[PDB]
Amino acid sequence: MGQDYYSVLGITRNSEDAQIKQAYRRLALKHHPLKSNEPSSAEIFRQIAEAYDVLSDPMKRGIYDKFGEEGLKGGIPLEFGSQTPWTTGYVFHGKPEKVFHEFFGGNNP
Amino acid sequence: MGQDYYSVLGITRNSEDAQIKQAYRRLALKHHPLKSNEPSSAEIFRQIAEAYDVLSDPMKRGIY
Amino acid sequence: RLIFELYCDVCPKTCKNFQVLCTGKAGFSQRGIRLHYKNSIFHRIVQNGWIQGGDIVYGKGDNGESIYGPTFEDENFSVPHNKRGVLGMANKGRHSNGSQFYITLQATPYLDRKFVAFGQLIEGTEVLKQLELVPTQNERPIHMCRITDSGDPYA
Amino acid sequence: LEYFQRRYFTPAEVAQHNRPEDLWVSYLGRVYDLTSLAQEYKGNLLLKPIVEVAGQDISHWFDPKTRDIRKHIDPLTGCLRYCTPRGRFVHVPPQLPCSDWANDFGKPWWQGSYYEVGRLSAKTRSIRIINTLTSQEHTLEVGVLESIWEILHRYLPYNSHAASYTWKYEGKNLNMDFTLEENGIRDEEEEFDYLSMDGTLHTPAILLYFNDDL
């Protein structure tokens, strides 16, 4: 079963970009390593940052809504005029602090 | 006006933690009381140690 | 086409200003500026924010003249900006509403008690979506977004 | 030398111009002359952060990848926005739909090359210059990419006749068009920092030998 990015953010599938960003800031501030010292907080914050990195991009959100996480990470078959038969699948870079830095403009929110 | 910790360490505000530690290590060795006998060296060394103490902590650096 | 409903019961002087500026029945003001939204351009578009047009003088966003003069007072703030498509004036401050209008692209509750909301967008969801999807440089649209015609759709 | 456009400026030289009447700022390795911008926006409240950061490095304001201001997303609004902890400055759009702000400025000052005057010598080192005639010695802070022509241009107040001198390092003549590293004066600053001593005592010295004053 794929990871539900909307359920990770704790919101609805048809939530707008403001609701996605409001879910991210509340959950990132709650599960930040500087504020939360739980061992599972780092994994939860990494999942939330990965979920936000998909849903903030309209192209990543559209593929994930159409084909799921399996289609998004594994790529989709290109139906028109491509040498590569599949798209470059979405790979998370594994740095949840980079999504935090992009969202909050720095390391300190 | 407060003391500029980046100017005391002789680094820019975008310097990383490794550059902060390298600038602190070079300046502390130059202005150590066992090596430098200048009267202003003790005050300069105290300012550098205060500057490193602020900039090493990510929370203190964010507040500053 | 972007069709707007104007809450004349809530903001009568405001909606009359917008409707006359839509129709252009006032002609020219005392300063020689046409009081009509034809060829008035959308000079500011903000992603997840608003699209701003109605600069009937230069299209630069720093000017605009209402039908009661250069600026008219804020009528009320009863209508909230709680949804996408809320129509109000962009002003230079308190009691400085002109001809420049903004259409919200999402819920913007921070705009309450600062800008007079007086209406909503009722037709043209794809038109507003394409205007939102127009790329911008420092919130100014790169493409040339213009109001080709304006007035009363049922006249 | 009247129309000589200097390509490299030292951080001390950049910090020397920190006035409203002569304002130089540096970010991402480039030096920008915003004197015309300050004269245009004199009396504006948006000029105050620029006057405050005048003569200082503002690379922390800008994203190194996109060469624009760093962008934070406001938690209340859910929108992307330039992050200005010190307040809004020139050519930055406001927070709200405001009809007193105009987008007619086109390209901003941080994106246009009109205000750019050259590059910043972020990496720099001291070199001693010793004459073999009068036994005089100076210490000059020069860049690694700075040529010996630019070094002698900086040294020209100290010796206007130094263009007629033969520049030598360890007994061999220096190439005039080359840099210090190309000539052979290696940069041992990282070695000195690793080995933990003072590099001022062992700043490399260039010997000037007199030939004629013609």
Coordinates of C-alpha atoms in Angstrom, one line a residue:
Chain A
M1 CA 0.0 0.0 0.0
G2 CA 1.3 3.4 -1.0
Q3 CA 1.8 6.3 1.5
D4 CA -1.2 8.6 1.5
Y5 CA 0.4 12.1 1.3
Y6 CA -2.9 13.8 2.2
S7 CA -3.3 11.5 5.3
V8 CA 0.3 12.2 6.3
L9 CA -0.5 15.9 6.2
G10 CA -3.8 15.1 7.9
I11 CA -6.0 16.9 5.3
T12 CA -8.3 16.1 2.4
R13 CA -7.4 15.1 -1.2
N14 CA -9.0 18.3 -2.6
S15 CA -7.4 20.6 -0.1
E16 CA -6.1 23.8 -1.7
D17 CA -2.5 25.0 -1.8
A18 CA -3.1 27.2 1.3
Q19 CA -4.6 24.2 3.2
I20 CA -1.6 22.0 2.1
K21 CA 0.8 24.7 3.3
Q22 CA -1.2 25.3 6.5
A23 CA -1.1 21.6 7.2
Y24 CA 2.7 21.6 6.6
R25 CA 3.6 24.5 8.9
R26 CA 1.5 23.2 11.8
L27 CA 2.9 19.7 11.5
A28 CA 6.5 20.9 10.8
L29 CA 6.5 23.1 13.9
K30 CA 4.9 20.3 16.0
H31 CA 7.4 17.7 14.7
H32 CA 10.6 19.8 14.4
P33 CA 13.7 18.3 15.9
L34 CA 14.4 21.6 17.8
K35 CA 10.9 21.4 19.4
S36 CA 10.1 17.7 19.4
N37 CA 12.6 15.2 20.9
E38 CA 10.6 12.0 20.2
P39 CA 12.4 9.3 18.2
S40 CA 9.5 8.9 15.8
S41 CA 9.3 12.7 15.3
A42 CA 12.2 12.6 12.8
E43 CA 10.5 10.0 10.7
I44 CA 7.1 11.7 10.9
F45 CA 8.7 15.1 9.9
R46 CA 10.5 13.4 7.0
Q47 CA 7.2 11.9 5.8
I48 CA 5.5 15.3 6.1
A49 CA 8.2 17.1 4.2
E50 CA 8.1 14.4 1.5
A51 CA 4.3 14.7 1.4
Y52 CA 4.5 18.5 1.1
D53 CA 7.2 18.2 -1.7
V54 CA 4.7 16.2 -3.7
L55 CA 1.5 18.2 -3.1
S56 CA 3.1 21.7 -3.5
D57 CA 4.2 20.9 -7.0
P58 CA 1.1 20.8 -9.3
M59 CA 2.7 18.3 -11.6
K60 CA 3.7 15.9 -8.8
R61 CA 0.2 16.3 -7.3
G62 CA -1.5 15.6 -10.6
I63 CA 0.5 12.4 -11.2
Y64 CA 0.0 11.2 -7.6
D65 CA -3.8 11.9 -7.8
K66 CA -4.0 10.0 -11.2
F67 CA -1.7 7.1 -10.6
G68 CA -0.8 7.0 -6.8
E69 CA 2.6 6.9 -5.2
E70 CA 3.6 3.9 -7.2
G71 CA 3.1 5.7 -10.5
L72 CA 4.7 8.9 -9.1
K73 CA 7.9 7.2 -7.8
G74 CA 8.1 4.6 -10.6
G75 CA 7.2 7.0 -13.5
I76 CA 4.4 7.0 -16.0
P77 CA 4.6 5.6 -19.6
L78 CA 5.2 8.4 -22.1
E79 CA 2.6 8.1 -24.9
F80 CA 3.9 10.6 -27.4
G81 CA 7.4 11.1 -28.9
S82 CA 9.9 10.2 -26.2
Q83 CA 13.1 8.2 -26.5
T84 CA 12.7 7.2 -22.8
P85 CA 9.6 5.0 -22.5
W86 CA 9.0 6.1 -18.9
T87 CA 9.2 9.5 -17.1
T88 CA 11.9 10.1 -14.5
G89 CA 10.1 8.9 -11.4
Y90 CA 10.0 11.2 -8.4
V91 CA 12.8 10.4 -5.9
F92 CA 12.8 12.2 -2.6
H93 CA 16.2 13.7 -1.9
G94 CA 16.1 12.6 1.7
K95 CA 16.7 16.0 3.3
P96 CA 13.6 17.2 5.2
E97 CA 15.5 20.3 6.3
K98 CA 15.7 21.4 2.7
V99 CA 11.9 21.4 2.4
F100 CA 11.8 23.2 5.8
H101 CA 14.3 25.7 4.5
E102 CA 12.4 26.3 1.3
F103 CA 9.1 26.7 3.2
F104 CA 10.2 28.9 6.0
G105 CA 13.1 30.8 4.3
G106 CA 15.7 29.5 6.6
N107 CA 16.6 27.0 9.4
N108 CA 14.7 29.1 12.0
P109 CA 10.9 29.3 11.4
Chain B
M1 CA 24.5 49.4 18.7
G2 CA 25.4 45.9 19.8
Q3 CA 28.6 44.1 19.0
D4 CA 28.6 42.5 15.6
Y5 CA 29.7 38.8 16.2
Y6 CA 30.3 38.2 12.5
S7 CA 32.5 41.2 12.3
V8 CA 34.4 40.2 15.4
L9 CA 35.0 36.7 13.9
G10 CA 35.9 38.3 10.6
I11 CA 33.3 36.4 8.6
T12 CA 30.2 37.1 6.6
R13 CA 26.6 36.5 7.9
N14 CA 26.2 33.6 5.4
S15 CA 29.2 31.6 6.8
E16 CA 28.6 28.0 7.7
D17 CA 29.4 26.4 11.1
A18 CA 32.7 25.0 9.8
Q19 CA 33.8 28.5 8.8
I20 CA 32.7 29.8 12.2
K21 CA 34.8 27.2 13.9
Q22 CA 37.8 27.8 11.7
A23 CA 37.6 31.6 12.2
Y24 CA 37.3 31.0 15.9
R25 CA 40.2 28.6 16.1
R26 CA 42.5 30.9 14.1
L27 CA 41.6 34.0 16.1
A28 CA 41.7 32.3 19.5
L29 CA 45.2 31.0 18.8
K30 CA 46.3 34.4 17.6
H31 CA 44.8 36.3 20.6
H32 CA 45.5 33.7 23.4
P33 CA 47.0 35.2 26.5
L34 CA 49.8 32.6 26.4
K35 CA 50.9 33.7 22.9
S36 CA 49.8 37.4 22.7
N37 CA 51.0 39.8 25.4
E38 CA 49.2 42.8 24.0
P39 CA 46.8 44.6 26.5
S40 CA 44.0 44.6 24.0
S41 CA 44.4 40.9 23.2
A42 CA 42.5 39.8 26.3
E43 CA 39.5 42.0 25.4
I44 CA 39.6 40.8 21.8
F45 CA 39.8 37.2 22.9
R46 CA 36.8 37.7 25.1
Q47 CA 34.8 39.2 22.3
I48 CA 35.8 36.3 20.0
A49 CA 34.8 33.7 22.6
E50 CA 31.4 35.5 23.1
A51 CA 31.0 35.6 19.3
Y52 CA 31.7 31.9 19.0
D53 CA 29.3 31.1 21.9
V54 CA 26.5 32.9 20.1
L55 CA 27.1 31.6 16.6
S56 CA 27.7 27.9 17.6
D57 CA 24.3 27.4 19.0
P58 CA 21.7 27.3 16.2
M59 CA 19.0 28.7 18.4
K60 CA 21.2 31.6 19.6
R61 CA 22.3 32.3 16.0
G62 CA 18.7 32.4 14.9
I63 CA 17.7 34.8 17.6
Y64 CA 20.7 37.0 16.9
Chain C
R1 CA -15.6 36.4 -19.7
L2 CA -15.5 37.2 -16.0
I3 CA -19.0 38.0 -14.7
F4 CA -19.3 39.6 -11.3
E5 CA -22.3 40.0 -8.9
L6 CA -22.1 43.3 -7.0
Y7 CA -23.6 43.4 -3.5
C8 CA -25.4 46.7 -3.9
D9 CA -27.4 46.2 -0.7
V10 CA -24.1 46.1 1.3
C11 CA -21.9 48.6 -0.5
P12 CA -24.2 50.9 -2.6
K13 CA -21.7 53.7 -3.4
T14 CA -18.9 51.1 -4.0
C15 CA -20.9 48.9 -6.3
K16 CA -22.2 51.9 -8.2
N17 CA -18.6 53.0 -8.6
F18 CA -17.5 49.6 -10.0
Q19 CA -20.6 49.3 -12.3
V20 CA -20.2 52.8 -13.8
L21 CA -16.4 52.1 -14.2
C22 CA -17.5 48.8 -15.9
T23 CA -20.0 50.5 -18.2
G24 CA -18.2 53.8 -18.7
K25 CA -21.4 55.8 -18.6
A26 CA -19.5 58.6 -16.8
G27 CA -17.2 59.2 -19.8
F28 CA -14.3 61.3 -18.7
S29 CA -13.5 62.6 -15.2
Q30 CA -12.4 66.1 -14.3
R31 CA -8.7 65.1 -14.9
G32 CA -9.3 63.8 -18.4
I33 CA -9.0 60.2 -17.4
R34 CA -11.6 57.8 -18.9
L35 CA -13.7 56.2 -16.2
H36 CA -14.1 52.8 -18.1
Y37 CA -12.6 49.4 -17.7
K38 CA -12.0 48.7 -21.4
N39 CA -8.3 48.3 -22.2
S40 CA -7.6 48.3 -18.4
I41 CA -4.9 45.7 -17.7
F42 CA -4.2 43.3 -14.9
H43 CA -1.0 44.8 -13.6
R44 CA -0.4 42.5 -10.6
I45 CA -1.0 38.8 -10.2
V46 CA 0.0 36.9 -7.1
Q47 CA 0.2 33.1 -6.9
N48 CA -2.2 31.8 -4.2
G49 CA -3.1 35.5 -3.7
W50 CA -5.0 37.8 -5.9
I51 CA -5.1 39.2 -9.5
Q52 CA -5.1 43.0 -9.5
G53 CA -6.3 45.2 -12.4
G54 CA -8.4 48.3 -12.9
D55 CA -5.5 50.8 -13.4
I56 CA -7.5 52.8 -15.9
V57 CA -4.8 55.5 -16.3
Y58 CA -1.5 53.9 -17.1
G59 CA -1.9 50.2 -16.2
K60 CA 1.1 50.5 -13.8
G61 CA -0.8 50.0 -10.5
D62 CA 0.1 53.4 -8.8
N63 CA -2.9 55.4 -10.0
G64 CA -6.6 55.1 -10.8
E65 CA -9.6 57.4 -10.5
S66 CA -13.1 56.6 -9.2
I67 CA -16.4 58.1 -10.4
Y68 CA -16.7 60.2 -7.2
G69 CA -13.3 61.8 -7.6
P70 CA -9.7 60.6 -7.2
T71 CA -10.4 58.5 -4.1
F72 CA -13.6 57.7 -2.2
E73 CA -14.0 56.5 1.4
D74 CA -14.2 52.9 2.6
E75 CA -17.9 52.1 2.8
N76 CA -17.9 49.0 5.0
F77 CA -16.1 45.7 5.6
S78 CA -19.2 43.4 6.1
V79 CA -18.3 41.1 3.2
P80 CA -15.4 38.8 4.1
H81 CA -12.7 37.5 1.9
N82 CA -13.4 34.0 3.0
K83 CA -13.4 32.3 -0.4
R84 CA -11.9 32.3 -3.9
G85 CA -13.3 35.0 -6.2
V86 CA -14.0 37.8 -3.8
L87 CA -13.9 41.2 -5.5
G88 CA -12.8 44.4 -3.8
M89 CA -10.8 47.6 -4.3
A90 CA -7.0 47.7 -3.8
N91 CA -6.4 51.0 -2.0
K92 CA -3.4 53.1 -0.8
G93 CA -4.6 53.0 2.8
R94 CA -7.7 53.9 4.7
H95 CA -10.4 55.8 2.6
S96 CA -8.3 55.7 -0.6
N97 CA -10.3 53.4 -2.9
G98 CA -10.0 54.1 -6.6
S99 CA -10.6 52.2 -9.8
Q100 CA -8.1 49.4 -9.1
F101 CA -9.8 46.1 -8.2
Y102 CA -8.6 42.7 -7.1
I103 CA -10.0 39.2 -7.4
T104 CA -9.0 36.8 -4.7
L105 CA -7.7 33.4 -5.9
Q106 CA -8.3 31.7 -2.5
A107 CA -9.6 32.5 1.0
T108 CA -7.8 35.6 2.3
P109 CA -9.1 36.5 5.7
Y110 CA -6.1 38.8 6.3
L111 CA -7.7 41.3 3.9
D112 CA -10.6 41.9 6.1
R113 CA -11.1 45.4 7.7
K114 CA -8.5 46.8 5.3
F115 CA -10.1 46.6 1.8
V116 CA -13.8 46.9 1.0
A117 CA -15.1 43.6 -0.3
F118 CA -18.3 44.2 -2.4
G119 CA -18.8 41.3 -4.7
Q120 CA -17.9 37.9 -6.1
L121 CA -17.0 36.2 -9.3
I122 CA -19.9 34.1 -10.6
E123 CA -18.9 33.0 -14.1
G124 CA -15.5 32.3 -15.7
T125 CA -13.8 29.8 -13.4
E126 CA -11.5 28.8 -16.3
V127 CA -10.9 32.4 -17.1
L128 CA -9.7 33.1 -13.6
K129 CA -7.7 29.9 -13.6
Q130 CA -5.9 30.8 -16.8
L131 CA -5.2 34.3 -15.3
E132 CA -3.8 32.7 -12.2
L133 CA -1.7 30.3 -14.3
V134 CA -0.1 33.3 -16.2
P135 CA 3.5 33.4 -15.1
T136 CA 4.6 36.6 -13.4
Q137 CA 7.9 38.5 -12.8
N138 CA 7.9 40.3 -9.4
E139 CA 4.1 39.7 -9.5
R140 CA 3.7 41.6 -12.7
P141 CA 2.3 39.3 -15.5
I142 CA 4.7 38.7 -18.4
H143 CA 1.8 38.2 -20.8
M144 CA -0.4 41.1 -21.8
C145 CA -3.6 40.5 -19.8
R146 CA -6.3 43.1 -20.8
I147 CA -10.0 43.7 -20.3
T148 CA -11.2 43.9 -24.0
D149 CA -14.8 44.7 -23.1
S150 CA -16.7 45.7 -19.9
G151 CA -20.1 46.8 -18.9
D152 CA -23.5 45.2 -18.2
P153 CA -23.9 41.6 -19.6
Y154 CA -27.7 41.9 -19.5
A155 CA -28.0 45.4 -21.1
Chain D
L1 CA 43.9 54.1 -16.6
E2 CA 41.1 56.7 -16.7
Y3 CA 38.8 54.2 -18.4
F4 CA 40.3 51.1 -16.8
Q5 CA 37.3 49.0 -15.6
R6 CA 38.6 47.1 -12.6
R7 CA 37.2 43.5 -12.6
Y8 CA 38.1 42.6 -9.0
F9 CA 37.2 44.6 -5.8
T10 CA 38.4 43.7 -2.4
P11 CA 35.8 43.5 0.5
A12 CA 37.6 46.4 2.2
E13 CA 37.2 48.5 -0.9
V14 CA 33.5 47.5 -1.1
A15 CA 33.0 48.4 2.6
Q16 CA 34.7 51.7 2.0
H17 CA 31.6 52.8 -0.1
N18 CA 28.8 52.6 2.5
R19 CA 27.3 56.0 2.3
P20 CA 24.0 57.2 0.8
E21 CA 26.0 59.3 -1.7
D22 CA 28.4 56.4 -2.5
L23 CA 26.7 53.0 -1.8
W24 CA 28.3 49.7 -2.9
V25 CA 26.9 46.3 -2.0
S26 CA 28.1 42.8 -2.7
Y27 CA 26.2 39.5 -3.0
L28 CA 27.0 36.2 -4.7
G29 CA 30.6 37.3 -5.5
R30 CA 29.6 40.4 -7.5
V31 CA 29.9 44.1 -6.5
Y32 CA 26.9 46.4 -7.3
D33 CA 27.0 50.2 -7.3
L34 CA 23.6 51.3 -6.0
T35 CA 24.5 55.0 -5.8
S36 CA 22.1 55.8 -8.7
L37 CA 19.4 53.6 -7.0
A38 CA 19.9 55.5 -3.7
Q39 CA 19.7 58.9 -5.5
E40 CA 16.5 57.7 -7.2
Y41 CA 14.9 56.4 -4.0
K42 CA 16.2 59.1 -1.6
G43 CA 13.7 59.9 1.1
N44 CA 11.9 56.6 0.7
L45 CA 11.5 54.2 3.7
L46 CA 12.4 51.3 1.5
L47 CA 15.9 52.7 1.0
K48 CA 16.6 52.4 4.8
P49 CA 17.5 48.6 4.8
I50 CA 19.8 49.2 1.8
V51 CA 21.6 52.1 3.5
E52 CA 21.8 50.0 6.7
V53 CA 23.4 47.0 4.8
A54 CA 25.5 49.4 2.7
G55 CA 29.2 48.2 2.5
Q56 CA 28.2 44.7 3.7
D57 CA 27.7 41.3 2.1
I58 CA 24.0 40.5 1.5
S59 CA 24.5 37.0 0.1
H60 CA 22.3 35.7 3.0
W61 CA 19.4 37.7 1.6
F62 CA 19.5 35.9 -1.8
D63 CA 19.1 32.3 -2.9
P64 CA 22.4 31.2 -4.5
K65 CA 20.5 28.9 -7.0
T66 CA 17.8 31.2 -8.5
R67 CA 19.8 34.5 -7.9
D68 CA 16.7 36.0 -6.3
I69 CA 15.7 36.9 -2.8
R70 CA 15.1 33.9 -0.5
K71 CA 11.5 32.8 -0.5
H72 CA 9.5 31.8 2.6
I73 CA 5.9 30.7 2.6
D74 CA 3.7 32.6 5.0
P75 CA 2.0 30.2 7.5
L76 CA -1.2 32.4 7.7
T77 CA -1.8 32.9 4.0
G78 CA -0.3 29.8 2.4
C79 CA 1.6 31.9 -0.2
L80 CA 5.2 32.3 -1.4
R81 CA 6.9 35.6 -0.5
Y82 CA 10.3 37.2 -0.3
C83 CA 11.7 36.8 3.2
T84 CA 12.6 40.2 4.6
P85 CA 13.5 40.0 8.4
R86 CA 14.8 43.5 8.3
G87 CA 11.7 44.9 6.5
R88 CA 10.6 45.5 3.0
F89 CA 13.1 47.4 0.7
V90 CA 13.3 48.8 -2.8
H91 CA 11.6 46.9 -5.7
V92 CA 10.1 44.4 -3.2
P93 CA 6.3 43.9 -3.7
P94 CA 4.1 44.6 -0.7
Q95 CA 2.2 42.2 1.5
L96 CA -1.3 43.3 0.4
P97 CA -3.1 44.5 -2.8
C98 CA -2.0 48.1 -2.7
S99 CA -2.7 50.8 -5.3
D100 CA 0.2 53.0 -4.2
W101 CA 2.8 50.4 -5.4
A102 CA 3.8 50.2 -9.1
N103 CA 5.3 47.2 -10.9
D104 CA 6.6 49.5 -13.7
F105 CA 10.3 49.3 -12.6
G106 CA 10.8 46.2 -14.8
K107 CA 13.9 44.2 -13.8
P108 CA 14.9 44.9 -10.1
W109 CA 18.3 46.1 -9.0
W110 CA 19.3 42.7 -7.7
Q111 CA 18.5 41.0 -11.1
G112 CA 19.8 43.7 -13.5
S113 CA 23.5 44.1 -14.5
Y114 CA 23.2 47.9 -14.8
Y115 CA 24.4 48.4 -11.3
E116 CA 27.2 45.8 -11.5
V117 CA 30.7 47.2 -11.5
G118 CA 32.8 44.0 -11.2
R119 CA 33.6 40.9 -9.1
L120 CA 34.4 40.6 -5.4
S121 CA 37.8 39.1 -4.3
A122 CA 36.2 36.7 -1.8
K123 CA 39.5 34.8 -1.6
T124 CA 42.3 37.1 -0.8
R125 CA 45.8 37.1 0.8
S126 CA 48.6 39.4 1.8
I127 CA 51.8 39.8 -0.1
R128 CA 54.9 41.6 1.0
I129 CA 56.7 43.8 -1.5
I130 CA 60.3 44.6 -0.7
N131 CA 62.6 46.9 -2.8
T132 CA 66.2 45.9 -3.0
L133 CA 67.3 49.5 -3.6
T134 CA 65.9 51.4 -0.6
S135 CA 65.1 48.3 1.6
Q136 CA 61.5 49.3 1.9
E137 CA 58.6 46.8 2.5
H138 CA 54.9 47.1 2.2
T139 CA 52.0 44.6 2.8
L140 CA 49.2 44.5 0.2
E141 CA 46.0 42.6 0.4
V142 CA 45.4 41.2 -3.1
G143 CA 43.2 38.6 -4.7
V144 CA 44.4 35.3 -6.0
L145 CA 42.9 36.0 -9.5
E146 CA 44.4 39.5 -9.5
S147 CA 47.2 39.8 -12.0
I148 CA 50.6 41.4 -11.4
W149 CA 49.4 44.3 -13.5
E150 CA 46.6 45.0 -11.1
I151 CA 48.9 44.4 -8.1
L152 CA 51.3 47.1 -9.5
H153 CA 48.2 49.3 -10.2
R154 CA 47.4 49.0 -6.5
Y155 CA 51.1 49.6 -5.6
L156 CA 51.4 52.7 -7.9
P157 CA 50.6 55.2 -5.0
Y158 CA 53.3 53.4 -2.9
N159 CA 55.7 53.6 -5.9
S160 CA 54.7 55.4 -9.0
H161 CA 58.0 54.3 -10.6
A162 CA 57.4 50.6 -9.8
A163 CA 56.4 50.0 -13.4
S164 CA 60.1 50.4 -14.3
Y165 CA 61.2 47.9 -11.6
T166 CA 61.8 44.2 -12.2
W167 CA 59.4 42.2 -10.1
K168 CA 61.2 39.1 -8.7
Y169 CA 60.1 36.3 -6.4
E170 CA 62.9 34.0 -5.0
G171 CA 65.4 35.2 -7.6
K172 CA 63.3 34.7 -10.7
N173 CA 61.4 37.4 -12.7
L174 CA 57.6 37.5 -12.4
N175 CA 55.4 37.3 -15.4
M176 CA 53.5 40.6 -15.7
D177 CA 50.3 39.3 -17.3
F178 CA 50.1 36.2 -15.0
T179 CA 48.7 35.8 -11.5
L180 CA 50.6 35.0 -8.4
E181 CA 49.7 31.2 -8.5
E182 CA 50.6 31.1 -12.2
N183 CA 53.9 32.8 -11.5
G184 CA 54.6 30.3 -8.7
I185 CA 53.8 32.1 -5.5
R186 CA 51.7 29.3 -4.0
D187 CA 48.8 29.8 -1.6
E188 CA 49.8 28.2 1.7
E189 CA 47.0 29.7 3.8
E190 CA 45.1 26.5 4.1
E191 CA 48.3 24.7 5.1
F192 CA 49.1 27.4 7.7
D193 CA 45.6 27.0 9.1
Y194 CA 46.0 23.3 9.3
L195 CA 49.5 23.6 10.9
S196 CA 48.2 26.3 13.3
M197 CA 50.6 29.2 13.2
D198 CA 50.5 32.9 12.3
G199 CA 50.8 33.4 8.6
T200 CA 51.7 37.1 8.9
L201 CA 55.3 36.3 9.7
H202 CA 55.5 34.1 6.6
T203 CA 53.6 36.2 4.1
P204 CA 55.5 35.7 0.8
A205 CA 57.7 38.5 -0.3
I206 CA 58.3 39.9 -3.8
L207 CA 61.6 41.6 -4.4
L208 CA 61.8 44.6 -6.7
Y209 CA 65.1 45.1 -8.5
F210 CA 65.9 48.5 -10.0
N211 CA 66.9 48.8 -13.7
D212 CA 66.3 52.4 -14.8
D213 CA 63.9 55.3 -14.3
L214 CA 63.4 56.0 -18.1

